[PDB]
Scaffold this active site. Sequence first.
Site, PDB file in Angstrom:
ATOM      1  N   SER B  18      49.043  11.837  30.535  1.00  0.00           N
ATOM      2  CA  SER B  18      48.941  10.526  31.170  1.00  0.00           C
ATOM      3  C   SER B  18      49.933  10.436  32.328  1.00  0.00           C
ATOM      4  O   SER B  18      51.088  10.875  32.205  1.00  0.00           O
ATOM      5  CB  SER B  18      49.336   9.440  30.177  1.00  0.00           C
ATOM      6  OG  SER B  18      48.456   9.449  29.077  1.00  0.00           O
ATOM      7  N   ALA B  94      36.449   1.983  32.960  1.00  0.00           N
ATOM      8  CA  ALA B  94      35.096   1.510  33.243  1.00  0.00           C
ATOM      9  C   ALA B  94      34.184   2.173  32.201  1.00  0.00           C
ATOM     10  O   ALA B  94      34.427   3.318  31.843  1.00  0.00           O
ATOM     11  CB  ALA B  94      34.686   1.921  34.694  1.00  0.00           C
ATOM     12  N   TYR B 155      32.917   7.799  41.563  1.00  0.00           N
ATOM     13  CA  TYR B 155      34.011   6.871  41.177  1.00  0.00           C
ATOM     14  C   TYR B 155      33.457   5.442  41.108  1.00  0.00           C
ATOM     15  O   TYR B 155      33.917   4.606  40.346  1.00  0.00           O
ATOM     16  CB  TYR B 155      35.158   6.947  42.198  1.00  0.00           C
ATOM     17  CG  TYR B 155      36.471   6.355  41.728  1.00  0.00           C
ATOM     18  CD1 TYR B 155      37.156   6.916  40.656  1.00  0.00           C
ATOM     19  CD2 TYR B 155      37.016   5.230  42.355  1.00  0.00           C
ATOM     20  CE1 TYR B 155      38.369   6.393  40.251  1.00  0.00           C
ATOM     21  CE2 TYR B 155      38.224   4.688  41.968  1.00  0.00           C
ATOM     22  CZ  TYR B 155      38.904   5.297  40.916  1.00  0.00           C
ATOM     23  OH  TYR B 155      40.098   4.800  40.487  1.00  0.00           O
ATOM     24  N   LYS B 162      39.729  -0.954  41.875  1.00  0.00           N
ATOM     25  CA  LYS B 162      40.991  -0.575  42.506  1.00  0.00           C
ATOM     26  C   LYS B 162      41.267  -1.378  43.798  1.00  0.00           C
ATOM     27  O   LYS B 162      42.417  -1.799  44.056  1.00  0.00           O
ATOM     28  CB  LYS B 162      41.082   0.947  42.757  1.00  0.00           C
ATOM     29  CG  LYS B 162      41.075   1.824  41.470  1.00  0.00           C
ATOM     30  CD  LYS B 162      42.225   1.434  40.496  1.00  0.00           C
ATOM     31  CE  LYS B 162      42.487   2.599  39.504  1.00  0.00           C
ATOM     32  NZ  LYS B 162      43.636   2.295  38.567  1.00  0.00           N
TER      33      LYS B 162
HETATM   34  N1  LIG Z   1      44.203  10.716  36.617  1.00  0.00           N
HETATM   35  C1  LIG Z   1      44.179  10.610  37.948  1.00  0.00           C
HETATM   36  O1  LIG Z   1      43.778  11.508  38.701  1.00  0.00           O
HETATM   37  C2  LIG Z   1      44.451   9.282  38.591  1.00  0.00           C
HETATM   38  C3  LIG Z   1      44.583   8.195  37.813  1.00  0.00           C
HETATM   39  N2  LIG Z   1      44.916   6.926  38.339  1.00  0.00           N
HETATM   40  C4  LIG Z   1      45.123   5.728  37.508  1.00  0.00           C
HETATM   41  O2  LIG Z   1      46.281   5.972  36.724  1.00  0.00           O
HETATM   42  C5  LIG Z   1      46.234   5.107  35.564  1.00  0.00           C
HETATM   43  C6  LIG Z   1      46.548   5.912  34.327  1.00  0.00           C
HETATM   44  O3  LIG Z   1      45.576   6.969  34.260  1.00  0.00           O
HETATM   45  P1  LIG Z   1      45.658   8.338  33.451  1.00  0.00           P
HETATM   46  O4  LIG Z   1      47.159   8.429  33.074  1.00  0.00           O
HETATM   47  O5  LIG Z   1      45.064   9.392  34.279  1.00  0.00           O
HETATM   48  O6  LIG Z   1      44.624   8.379  32.189  1.00  0.00           O
HETATM   49  P2  LIG Z   1      44.944   7.906  30.652  1.00  0.00           P
HETATM   50  O7  LIG Z   1      43.585   7.912  30.094  1.00  0.00           O
HETATM   51  O8  LIG Z   1      45.977   8.911  30.175  1.00  0.00           O
HETATM   52  O9  LIG Z   1      45.608   6.480  30.693  1.00  0.00           O
HETATM   53  C7  LIG Z   1      44.729   5.347  30.700  1.00  0.00           C
HETATM   54  C8  LIG Z   1      45.406   4.400  29.756  1.00  0.00           C
HETATM   55  O10 LIG Z   1      44.743   3.122  29.838  1.00  0.00           O
HETATM   56  C9  LIG Z   1      44.786   2.571  28.534  1.00  0.00           C
HETATM   57  N3  LIG Z   1      43.852   1.458  28.433  1.00  0.00           N
HETATM   58  C10 LIG Z   1      42.495   1.405  28.638  1.00  0.00           C
HETATM   59  N4  LIG Z   1      41.960   0.245  28.343  1.00  0.00           N
HETATM   60  C11 LIG Z   1      43.025  -0.493  27.840  1.00  0.00           C
HETATM   61  C12 LIG Z   1      43.093  -1.723  27.158  1.00  0.00           C
HETATM   62  N5  LIG Z   1      42.053  -2.544  26.990  1.00  0.00           N
HETATM   63  N6  LIG Z   1      44.316  -2.164  26.766  1.00  0.00           N
HETATM   64  C13 LIG Z   1      45.371  -1.378  26.958  1.00  0.00           C
HETATM   65  N7  LIG Z   1      45.411  -0.152  27.485  1.00  0.00           N
HETATM   66  C14 LIG Z   1      44.201   0.227  27.929  1.00  0.00           C
HETATM   67  C15 LIG Z   1      44.519   3.751  27.602  1.00  0.00           C
HETATM   68  O11 LIG Z   1      44.951   3.492  26.264  1.00  0.00           O
HETATM   69  C16 LIG Z   1      45.351   4.845  28.286  1.00  0.00           C
HETATM   70  O12 LIG Z   1      46.670   4.833  27.757  1.00  0.00           O
HETATM   71  C17 LIG Z   1      44.859   4.430  35.589  1.00  0.00           C
HETATM   72  O13 LIG Z   1      44.995   3.160  36.227  1.00  0.00           O
HETATM   73  C18 LIG Z   1      44.044   5.349  36.494  1.00  0.00           C
HETATM   74  O14 LIG Z   1      43.009   4.631  37.164  1.00  0.00           O
HETATM   75  C19 LIG Z   1      45.127   6.812  39.746  1.00  0.00           C
HETATM   76  C20 LIG Z   1      44.957   7.848  40.541  1.00  0.00           C
HETATM   77  C21 LIG Z   1      44.543   9.205  40.092  1.00  0.00           C
HETATM   78  C1  LIG Z   2      37.994  14.439  42.841  1.00  0.00           C
HETATM   79  C2  LIG Z   2      37.216  13.105  43.077  1.00  0.00           C
HETATM   80  C3  LIG Z   2      37.396  11.944  42.057  1.00  0.00           C
HETATM   81  C4  LIG Z   2      38.866  11.558  41.828  1.00  0.00           C
HETATM   82  C5  LIG Z   2      39.154  10.662  40.621  1.00  0.00           C
HETATM   83  C6  LIG Z   2      40.673  10.578  40.342  1.00  0.00           C
HETATM   84  C7  LIG Z   2      40.955   9.660  39.185  1.00  0.00           C
HETATM   85  C8  LIG Z   2      41.080   8.345  39.463  1.00  0.00           C
HETATM   86  C9  LIG Z   2      41.255   7.397  38.397  1.00  0.00           C
HETATM   87  O1  LIG Z   2      41.411   6.182  38.558  1.00  0.00           O
HETATM   88  C10 LIG Z   2      41.226   7.965  37.045  1.00  0.00           C
HETATM   89  O2  LIG Z   2      41.361   7.097  35.994  1.00  0.00           O
HETATM   90  C11 LIG Z   2      40.226   6.472  35.463  1.00  0.00           C
HETATM   91  C12 LIG Z   2      38.988   6.498  36.098  1.00  0.00           C
HETATM   92  C13 LIG Z   2      37.902   5.904  35.464  1.00  0.00           C
HETATM   93  C14 LIG Z   2      38.051   5.329  34.221  1.00  0.00           C
HETATM   94  C15 LIG Z   2      39.288   5.331  33.594  1.00  0.00           C
HETATM   95  C16 LIG Z   2      40.411   5.877  34.216  1.00  0.00           C
HETATM   96  C17 LIG Z   2      41.748   5.926  33.524  1.00  0.00           C
HETATM   97  C18 LIG Z   2      41.083   9.288  36.797  1.00  0.00           C
HETATM   98  N1  LIG Z   2      40.954  10.154  37.837  1.00  0.00           N
HETATM   99  C19 LIG Z   2      40.883  11.585  37.545  1.00  0.00           C
END
Ligand SMILES: NC(=O)C1=CN([C@@H]2O[C@H](COP(=O)(O)OP(=O)(O)OC[C@H]3O[C@@H](n4cnc5c(N)ncnc54)[C@H](O)[C@@H]3O)[C@@H](O)[C@H]2O)C=CC1
Ligand SMILES: CCCCCCc1cc(=O)c(Oc2ccccc2C)cn1C
Lengths: 239, 239, 239, 239
Positions: B18, B94, B155, B162
């Site tokens: 995470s 989502a 996405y 976002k």
């Molecule tokens: N993974 C990536 O490449 C990127 C991720 N993000 C954003 O970063 C943030 C964290 O993402 P990640 O760490 O990658 O994935 P993750 O899946 O590790 O974290 C998502 C978290 O959201 C929580 N969540 C979902 N619905 C919820 C609810 N109803 N109540 C409380 N918690 C809730 C989950 O329990 C989880 O801990 C998200 O906002 C995601 O959109 C932004 C840019 C890139």
């Molecule tokens: C390479 C092109 C696509 C890039 C996407 C990057 C990216 C953006 C995010 O917001 C994300 O998180 C979520 C997205 C949807 C649902 C839930 C969560 C937590 C994960 N990822 C991996």
Amino acid sequence: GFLSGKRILVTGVASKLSIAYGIAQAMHREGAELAFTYQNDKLKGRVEEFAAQLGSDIVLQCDVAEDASIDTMFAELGKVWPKFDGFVHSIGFAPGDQLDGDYVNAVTREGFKIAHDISSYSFVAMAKACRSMLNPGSALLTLSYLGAERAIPNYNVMGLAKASLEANVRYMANAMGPEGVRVNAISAGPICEAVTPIRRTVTIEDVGNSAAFLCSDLSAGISGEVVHVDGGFSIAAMN
Amino acid sequence: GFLSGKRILVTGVASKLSIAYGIAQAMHREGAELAFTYQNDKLKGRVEEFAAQLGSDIVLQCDVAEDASIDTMFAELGKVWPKFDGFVHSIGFAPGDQLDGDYVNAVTREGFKIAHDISSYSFVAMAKACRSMLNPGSALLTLSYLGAERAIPNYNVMGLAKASLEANVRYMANAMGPEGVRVNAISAGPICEAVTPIRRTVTIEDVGNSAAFLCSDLSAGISGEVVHVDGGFSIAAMN
Amino acid sequence: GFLSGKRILVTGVASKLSIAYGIAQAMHREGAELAFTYQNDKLKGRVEEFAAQLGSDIVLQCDVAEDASIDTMFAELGKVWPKFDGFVHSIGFAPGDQLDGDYVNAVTREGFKIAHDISSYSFVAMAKACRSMLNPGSALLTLSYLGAERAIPNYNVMGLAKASLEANVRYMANAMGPEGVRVNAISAGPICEAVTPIRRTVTIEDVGNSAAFLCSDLSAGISGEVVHVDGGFSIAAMN
Amino acid sequence: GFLSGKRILVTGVASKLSIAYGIAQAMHREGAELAFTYQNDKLKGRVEEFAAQLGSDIVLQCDVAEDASIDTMFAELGKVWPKFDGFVHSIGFAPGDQLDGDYVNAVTREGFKIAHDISSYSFVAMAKACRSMLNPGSALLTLSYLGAERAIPNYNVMGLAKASLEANVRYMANAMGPEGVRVNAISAGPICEAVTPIRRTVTIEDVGNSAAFLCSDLSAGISGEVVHVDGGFSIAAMN
Ligand SMILES: NC(=O)C1=CN([C@@H]2O[C@H](COP(=O)(O)OP(=O)(O)OC[C@H]3O[C@@H](n4cnc5c(N)ncnc54)[C@H](O)[C@@H]3O)[C@@H](O)[C@H]2O)C=CC1
Ligand SMILES: CCCCCCc1cc(=O)c(Oc2ccccc2C)cn1C
Ligand SMILES: NC(=O)C1=CN([C@@H]2O[C@H](COP(=O)(O)OP(=O)(O)OC[C@H]3O[C@@H](n4cnc5c(N)ncnc54)[C@H](O)[C@@H]3O)[C@@H](O)[C@H]2O)C=CC1
Ligand SMILES: NC(=O)C1=CN([C@@H]2O[C@H](COP(=O)(O)OP(=O)(O)OC[C@H]3O[C@@H](n4cnc5c(N)ncnc54)[C@H](O)[C@@H]3O)[C@@H](O)[C@H]2O)C=CC1
Ligand SMILES: NC(=O)C1=CN([C@@H]2O[C@H](COP(=O)(O)OP(=O)(O)OC[C@H]3O[C@@H](n4cnc5c(N)ncnc54)[C@H](O)[C@@H]3O)[C@@H](O)[C@H]2O)C=CC1
Ligand SMILES: CCCCCCc1cc(=O)c(Oc2ccccc2C)cn1C
Ligand SMILES: CCCCCCc1cc(=O)c(Oc2ccccc2C)cn1C
Ligand SMILES: CCCCCCc1cc(=O)c(Oc2ccccc2C)cn1C
């Protein structure tokens, strides 16, 4: 502190009020070794005494109007710092007649030329002149203003020069990234507080702490960015 | 370190992968006391063991879909931290059918609703629920993605959520600034490296170090900002 | 004139002061054939009158809160216009309690939901329901506001709904472009003067004339764009 | 058509492939009366021919490197057009060595100077020289490119000159708006296809039709704006 083991060159120190002064103090506090440049004979003594206060004795002339001056400066720097970890560009100028009254009436081909030459071109002139000296992990930083993105009365051709500077930041970040160099700017608020979200003007301390961050390994994920350090002013309308 | 004496609540820890995990490690390293939330029964044990690894034993249930859950969580937090210094919102969702194929065909009124409710509304739901608890100097942080500002295939409705989130950051920064609270986001790169200026994908370490900065007094001059921590990807075209 | 041959549906004409009225007049002047929708039975007689003035007899009820209401209206429209060349979405709503006072104090989960649903989701809900009826060369248009991009006092959760709307324009343009549909927004100035470059507030005629352009083949090179028709207000600072 | 009554000067027609040619055709079609400039004596005969095709006999030499050349041309234009309603600036130049390879390696002080002077300063140099000749309701237009906003390989110092140009649009719009002059840019797509939403490259007809609009009273609500006429290329990512 978070700049320990970094060697950073700081341009632009002219007084205790300069943004470069604030940056240099924040960087010293966080453990950097610093080097300083001074534009001209008038400023030398002041820059020497500041540098001694912050434990440095690398104080070198550099007028960024002149390629030879920049090249000499970096050759001198090379004798004490054969390699180093980036520089702070805190240098702006436009002739005074550029900065008064209606923009279209005030701007001239010569005032435009100098504005862009000193405020925008010199940032990449420096980077060209020291490219082979930068360690991987290096970071370059310059200072811009909201005038780059909004029409502000009296700031006039300096806004066009800041827009060119911010484009420079992107083009440099892209060119230099593969050798492990990052390039950013801070768009500083003026050094209108009732319409600033934080409800105060920013200080050279605030700017200095953001600068230290952006030149450190903490900001490894950031490059080509113009970070607004203006207390949220640019994102508000009508308060 | 630069977060010593700060008390920060960290949402969103689900695994070692995470982004919230990376943030929590950087903040712990810089001296913060941390508190953690967990969404549901499934995640509790994992979040407990991470919190114990980082010297915390404040681990509280919070499902941001429910106002009552958020209010209960902050009432529980209040027993150990009557006041505290801000929170990291690292929560996105989502329904899976939203994130496949042509955007116009995939999006539905319900998928849109949930996306925006969980990814954008919950950030200000949290701020409402703990407003009176925040010390002056507090800082709130959420996580966004380039999908807010570009159309990215698959996405889909998450980009609209976002964009709403980044607007939330501005509106919150403006509302809360006069009480001494800052509100920012990091637009993180995906956790395409040949067209990234730094020539590598960002890690949760890079993001974690930027997060620690933006929640600390170092970033006192920054509010309402979406800082790109994506290695310069968003500022490049055609490499 | 430059909309000859085009059949355009116009939503959101509520009075002679509506932006959609200025738009409908401008499109009728340029020779478009028009149809109109109206939200509920209090507006019916008067939209019928406005439509007749513009030589149209096609006036259909549509409440964009309901998927069934949108499908029915398009099913009716199909009886006269088996195909057509786009529509103007001039629909915005938030509950009144959302739009006064401190943003974080006023916003609620339900007010956020209703604002995003009606002011953002409905634009794509309409696209979904008529996608198979659109000719090559079609154009969709919605209306946005600067509150998408800045924190404006009182506009509050509308500024989030608007930011979601502008992202919806990009995702929709990207999805539908390949089948020959463009999607744009106007960001209109409020319908003050002393800091606007043109030194007057914009009118529904100004907006209508830009809307007519963006729906005509004259704008064949423009898609996914937010065009500011606000007299330059947004690009000025501190006048 | 919608430019009837308007007298517009068109710079930068160099061949049938020039953007200014597509613009001049579109404005002539909409009933504008036109004049043309040409840079030096090799283009003279052919611009005369293009002008005649468009029913114009007003064809004047102008090298925007020289203040005297601009003043003379406007002095000549005044003999036939004591007043007129704006001009299209379709002029860009950098030395060839600026536009190939690594940006930091290629850029020079002189190449930066010439790029900014010809591609940015000249737009305001023209405004300065004709400011007293402009009617209320006049409109100025220049052409920019995405390289103002992103780092594009090879475009190099043009991207800085373009960023300066777009800031020049804002400052000029702000300065001249009060006396009834608007100032805008088109950011045109390259004159690839698979990631552009409309799935085709834009043409000088697309651009010309948008230029005609931005110079006509139909765009009375738009000033200081950069309009992207690039088929949505800039708002897409990763297709
Ligand atoms: N993974 C990536 O490449 C990127 C991720 N993000 C954003 O970063 C943030 C964290 O993402 P990640 O760490 O990658 O994935 P993750 O899946 O590790 O974290 C998502 C978290 O959201 C929580 N969540 C979902 N619905 C919820 C609810 N109803 N109540 C409380 N918690 C809730 C989950 O329990 C989880 O801990 C998200 O906002 C995601 O959109 C932004 C840019 C890139
Ligand atoms: C390479 C092109 C696509 C890039 C996407 C990057 C990216 C953006 C995010 O917001 C994300 O998180 C979520 C997205 C949807 C649902 C839930 C969560 C937590 C994960 N990822 C991996
Ligand atoms: N003061 C403010 O409110 C803001 C200032 N800035 C920018 O911050 C930077 C530093 O500004 P300040 O510290 O306020 O003023 P300053 O006047 O203290 O610093 C300007 C420096 O530029 C140097 N300089 C000028 N021409 C030079 C030349 N040819 N060669 C070498 N050095 C040259 C001067 O010697 C001086 O040290 C400038 O880029 C300015 O545009 C940005 C935002 C707001
Ligand atoms: N008035 C202004 O200063 C500005 C207005 N806007 C936007 O322009 C658009 C039109 O606004 P106006 O013309 O000023 O006011 P308006 O009140 O004349 O038009 C709003 C329209 O939305 C319709 N509507 C609301 N809920 C609906 C629903 N459930 N189903 C169908 N129709 C529904 C109303 O019936 C009405 O026709 C809105 O999206 C608004 O946000 C944008 C910028 C500035
Ligand atoms: N071709 C493309 O893909 C794009 C072009 N642009 C811009 O559009 C504008 C026109 O470009 P094009 O029509 O493609 O090429 P072009 O080569 O047909 O037009 C360039 C014009 O600038 C004139 N010019 C150059 N130096 C001059 C000087 N000292 N004085 C007077 N005239 C001078 C040339 O005589 C010529 O008429 C330029 O500003 C260019 O940067 C913008 C976006 C994309
Ligand atoms: C309150 C409205 C106007 C805000 C201006 C803020 C501001 C921006 C700057 O770039 C700056 O530096 C220079 C400017 C011109 C010439 C030389 C330099 C060094 C100083 N100042 C103060
Ligand atoms: C300081 C605030 C200035 C805002 C003025 C511009 C403005 C923007 C809009 O979206 C608008 O439409 C609505 C707004 C809310 C709810 C429903 C509708 C239809 C009206 N007005 C006037
Ligand atoms: C990867 C690079 C893509 C760029 C293509 C778009 C593009 C942008 C321009 O400003 C342009 O005009 C000039 C450019 C340089 C010097 C002089 C002129 C007249 C031509 N072209 C083709």
